[PDB]
């Protein structure tokens, strides 16, 4: 969960910084989960279009993740002397002979992962109400004063207590 | 393929009796021994000038082109599929009996 | 209607062939009774020729059906 | 060769060793099912059985229930699955109360503590599997129809 | 005892380093479901057919045989299959490869029994593997190019299903 | 006297009619007998078995199943060398039949009469006299 | 053995036998007498060798008694069928005479009769090999010539010297 959140936190900051060539002409002005819905509107199966951007990610992440499934299943029943999180991935020597790393560097990994879980949750919800994205929100320390018109997500129901029960300042 | 022809697996047909199911040889030999005679053409509207194997394989491709839509009740797919698999299962049964039992 | 033909020497040929075929083949297959000069009697001859007129009639009618005649 | 022999070498027990009963494939399937798989606590046996059963329970209630043609069909189907789950957990608990004497053994299914563990795991996994089925059907239009969205 | 290709998984039990092309890659446990020797014979068969398929794709781009353009006008990769079922070519290759497969079926039964190595048909007329030092190199090399040709055959035929160009015409006309 | 557990059993191919879970948790019955031949008999629980020459042993769930086989062997093969035992899950074996070495239809000394009523059956007491009383209706 | 190297040696055949090449993939010699198999191979080849000439020569010259039809194959449908009935019974007489009443697998080879021999001589292993291989060639040849004459409806040499049209049916 921590590693996925760290990639998500880095992705949101970089997407606010720039985007890769040609992306802007397809997705338009969508940032931080609106781009997920926008791609999925133009992909076979979920929508109608010529893209498989989320689907390609699902394919390769799912192949790697069935491999990690077998690793987790073997580690659960004690058939393997492998610790948590260690997949042997360490191409440039960082732990100086062990892919698992030192006690300090895994403590660094776990704490930064916890930080990124909290942070990516914060960034997601602040976008879900302001529509600004990470750097505009952090710049706009007076907020709700002017917000970006942004689409309802693929789960609008969760935005139903914001109006009649909770204040809805926006 | 729960057990091949070679003495490799420990699959026991029952509690204590090991028995070599010859799933490669029986499946291959029964398929060829059923498909090759079935190539015999016939100028009947169901076959359309092909054999039963070839008209069947043609109706697989035709219905696969319209992939989500199933073949209709009057479509020749169902009758071709039935007769083909009927004679195929019969030739697998008889082939398994002949090969496992007589062993030659 | 399947097309049959009036009797000709080809029909005679099919009948004779099937008849001899059934004599020889029956002589081996029959389990209770000099390749044909040992134990060959009238019931064996009459049975092989009855199967000969059965195989021959089927062969004549089928070859007339398909066009071989 | 003969494929039917006395069960576990005993000619006078009330069973036979037939291919359905005792082949290698059958023994592999039986030995690997959560009820019989080795190395599992009764609670984990309960969780895996519950996740399976709760997941498939949602579907018949949703497709064929009284509110099936309404927009609350999935809500009613999930809640109907929940009602069946609660009734079945009551059945499991009363079975445990009347069938097992209280002993310290807790790692076998047929003990009082082992049955209570299995019931705890079965309720949690069952509600979890029903909730997962609810999420999947809610979001994917293929599952809402019978695959009929493609036509 | 960890898999070489997938470091976090236990080394496959049915698999061994004596096998040519071995890398410890069976994360799903399919080497236990079906017999390993059947799987090797199947893999080497697939390898050779796809090697032919890939080179045939490339060569059918590069040139065609005399008179072929008369019969095939615009059909390029799998359209030529469709028009040459009408002509006799596909029935001919099907008949003769099926003829070879009959003796291949005898040889598969033989290699199941254990007399023959998978994919071994003693076909070395030019005596490339006579030294035997090359033999092992050739064995591993054949498996590697076979796997690459399986991926390549798929990837070209799917590139042609997309564009219609075919491999070299896809490359030259980006 | 005691059951020699090692006695070979009659050849049998198995059946679904044999004993169930109550036999290994409540009680099982055993029958042993001597045969002069290797001959086919019918099992009380199902099909046919073959008794081995010499001494045979079976396990059945009910005592009546042991006695049904015993009557069948005595009439069909003239074998009276049968002994019926009751066996408990504690391992304790209870000899049952014939109980004192002599068959019940033949008289034996030292048998004490149980259940014998000193008058004829019409001399019993009417239910009303023995109502709210522990006194038995047999006089 | 030597013909199909990725299979086992049959081990029921040897280089002693005339036309041997170690070629027995199906293991037919394990289930039937090899004397009968040799006898069948030579006789089938001898009939095929006559059949090849029987398909070749009647194109150039057909007997004045008959009518030749269209091809030497199809000529059996235009000659009287009673003529071929006597062909059949005369060949049967030859079978019952040259074989001394022995017409079955248990019955042949009783006196030590060698497979090829019907009393026309004894030949070198090379000479018997020549006979066998020419027989095998003429067996394959008959199938090609007969089916060619069938589909084309033209004489073999008329087809060969004339435009070499593909066989189609
Ligand atoms: C899934 C996200 C996404 C999407 C939808 C696009 C979409 C597009 N990209 Mg971009 N791109 C992406 C990710 C994406 N890109 C990434 C991750 C990279 C790697 C750094 C690139 C690198 C890239 C380059 C270098 C270029 C594009 C270009 C293009 C456009 C192609 C027009 C054409 O004729 O193709 C022709 C080009 C190719 C077939 C291959 C290049 C198209 C709108 C081109 C562009 O701007 O067109 C206007 C261009 O030059 N893309
Ligand atoms: C080599 C000669 C020869 C030939 C060319 C044929 C050919 C034929 N026979 Mg004949 N037959 C033969 C020998 C031959 N048979 C012999 C030796 C016997 C044994 C006596 C028979 C007994 C036989 C019977 C009893 C019948 C035929 C029928 C048929 C025809 C239909 C089969 C069909 O498609 O039904 C397909 C039916 C299915 C159920 C397929 C599924 C077919 C043309 C049938 C027919 O319609 O005749 C007019 C028929 O009733 N045959
Ligand atoms: C699975 C493989 C496969 C398949 C299905 C096809 C199918 C087809 N090819 Mg392609 N082709 C292939 C491989 C394949 N080819 C290879 C390997 C090459 C050479 C690199 C070619 C080169 C080629 C050309 C140049 C042409 C075709 C054409 C065709 C069409 C008609 C058949 C023909 O004339 O073939 C001709 C093919 C060959 C002569 C190549 C045969 C190579 C052999 C089989 C390799 C085996 C050699 C080895 C020594 C034998 C050992 C046997 C062993 C088992 C013991 C048809 C659609 C024609 C067409 O219509 O194209 C538009 C055409 O002009 N093919
Ligand atoms: C299945 C594939 C296939 C097909 C359909 C054809 C079809 C044809 N070929 Mg080609 N050919 C093929 C494979 C094929 N060939 C192969 C594999 C070779 C050997 C390398 C040849 C070598 C060949 C030659 C040398 C010639 C033909 C010619 C011809 C044509 C006959 C025209 C005529 O007057 O005679 C005919 C359309 C002739 C022609 O006129 O075509 C230009 C000709 O001269 N063919
Ligand atoms: C064993 C011998 C054998 C024989 C007799 C034939 C006979 C034939 N082949 Mg086949 N063929 C064979 C082996 C054989 N083939 C093998 C081993 C292969 C490799 C897989 C092929 C691949 C093949 C193809 C791809 C084609 C034929 C074609 C033909 C036909 C050529 C007609 C023509 O005009 O010929 C005169 C031409 C020549 C003599 C050219 C040299 C004829 C049916 C052609 C056809 O129409 O199929 C029915 C065709 O396209 N053959
Ligand atoms: C030897 C393996 C191999 C190779 C070299 C190629 C190479 C190619 N394929 Mg093929 N492909 C392969 C296997 C292969 N593919 C397999 C196994 C599949 C599965 C069926 C496909 C399915 C496939 C499709 C569906 C498409 C390609 C496309 C492409 C091209 C652009 C690469 C691309 O967009 O990836 C992008 C690479 C990355 C994002 C890497 C990070 C390129 C010529 C595309 C193309 O342009 O062809 C029309 C395309 O649409 N291929
Ligand atoms: C009166 C007829 C007759 C008889 C009794 C024999 C007897 C014999 N022949 Mg001879 N033969 C004959 C006529 C005959 N032949 C003729 C006219 C031919 C064609 C030229 C042959 C061709 C021939 C060959 C090629 C072979 C024999 C062999 C044999 C021997 C074993 C088979 C047998 O017992 O008979 C069974 C045979 C017949 C009753 C007559 C056969 C005539 C043919 C096969 C026409 C049948 C038509 C039909 C397609 C058959 C298929 C059945 C089914 C599809 C309906 C035996 C010595 C075999 C052997 O090994 O010899 C030692 C052998 O290989 N014969
Ligand atoms: C060209 C093919 C050919 C060859 C090489 C042979 C060779 C042989 N045959 Mg066979 N045979 C053939 C054709 C052939 N025959 C045909 C067509 C028939 C059917 C009529 C027979 C019927 C036949 C029988 C019934 C017997 C033989 C026997 C023999 C052997 C003779 C023993 C001997 O004297 O030793 C020396 C060998 C020779 C002197 C043989 C000389 C080869 C001849 C003259 C072939 C010349 C062909 C010539 C160009 C004729 C063309 C005519 C055509 C255009 C119509 C020898 C191995 C006998 C034997 O022992 O079996 C092994 C035997 O009993 N053959
Ligand atoms: C491991 C490995 C390697 C690798 C690799 C990689 C790709 C490693 C990647 C590491 C990364 C990407 C780490 C990123 C962590 C992000 C964090 C901690 C931030 C959380 C955000 C917060 C707290 C916030 C906030 C915010 C709030 C809520 C409101 C917002 O409006 C704005 C704001 C931003 C202010 C390599 C390849 C070198 C090989 C090697 O041998 C092994
Ligand atoms: C792509 C997609 C979307 C999406 C999406 C995503 C990425 C959604 C991500 C949502 C996340 C990660 C929310 C995180 C919430 C974290 C919380 C409340 C932390 C509580 C911690 C506490 C209280 C700490 C307490 C404590 C502290 C402070 C100190 C004391 C100790 C302690 C108790 C630990 C959708 C769904 C929007 C729709 C869209 O169409 C498709």
Tab-separated table of N, CA and C in Angstrom, chain G residues 45 48-49 52 131-143:
chain	number	residue	atom	x	y	z
G	45	UNK	N	2.538	-55.968	-55.783
G	45	UNK	CA	3.439	-55.296	-56.735
G	45	UNK	C	3.337	-55.896	-58.126
G	48	UNK	N	0.209	-54.776	-59.733
G	48	UNK	CA	0.372	-53.338	-60.048
G	48	UNK	C	1.271	-53.161	-61.276
G	49	UNK	N	2.334	-53.964	-61.386
G	49	UNK	CA	3.260	-53.865	-62.546
G	49	UNK	C	2.486	-54.189	-63.825
G	52	UNK	N	0.107	-51.142	-64.503
G	52	UNK	CA	0.763	-49.957	-65.132
G	52	UNK	C	0.754	-50.153	-66.652
G	131	UNK	N	13.182	-56.859	-58.048
G	131	UNK	CA	11.747	-57.160	-58.189
G	131	UNK	C	10.889	-56.387	-57.189
G	132	UNK	N	11.270	-56.437	-55.899
G	132	UNK	CA	10.517	-55.770	-54.825
G	132	UNK	C	10.425	-54.266	-55.054
G	133	UNK	N	11.574	-53.612	-55.280
G	133	UNK	CA	11.591	-52.157	-55.437
G	133	UNK	C	10.855	-51.693	-56.698
G	134	UNK	N	10.995	-52.428	-57.820
G	134	UNK	CA	10.203	-52.127	-59.016
G	134	UNK	C	8.710	-52.318	-58.744
G	135	UNK	N	8.366	-53.321	-57.924
G	135	UNK	CA	6.980	-53.533	-57.523
G	135	UNK	C	6.409	-52.391	-56.722
G	136	UNK	N	7.178	-51.911	-55.743
G	136	UNK	CA	6.788	-50.761	-54.932
G	136	UNK	C	6.601	-49.506	-55.787
G	137	UNK	N	7.526	-49.281	-56.736
G	137	UNK	CA	7.403	-48.157	-57.666
G	137	UNK	C	6.143	-48.274	-58.518
G	138	UNK	N	5.872	-49.472	-59.049
G	138	UNK	CA	4.692	-49.658	-59.887
G	138	UNK	C	3.388	-49.591	-59.091
G	139	UNK	N	3.415	-49.957	-57.795
G	139	UNK	CA	2.258	-49.749	-56.922
G	139	UNK	C	1.919	-48.274	-56.780
G	140	UNK	N	2.918	-47.437	-56.479
G	140	UNK	CA	2.680	-45.986	-56.407
G	140	UNK	C	2.251	-45.409	-57.762
G	141	UNK	N	2.894	-45.903	-58.830
G	141	UNK	CA	2.655	-45.459	-60.200
G	141	UNK	C	1.217	-45.680	-60.628
G	142	UNK	N	0.643	-46.837	-60.259
G	142	UNK	CA	-0.725	-47.183	-60.639
G	142	UNK	C	-1.724	-46.194	-60.048
G	143	UNK	N	-1.519	-45.808	-58.785
G	143	UNK	CA	-2.412	-44.856	-58.146
G	143	UNK	C	-2.378	-43.509	-58.835
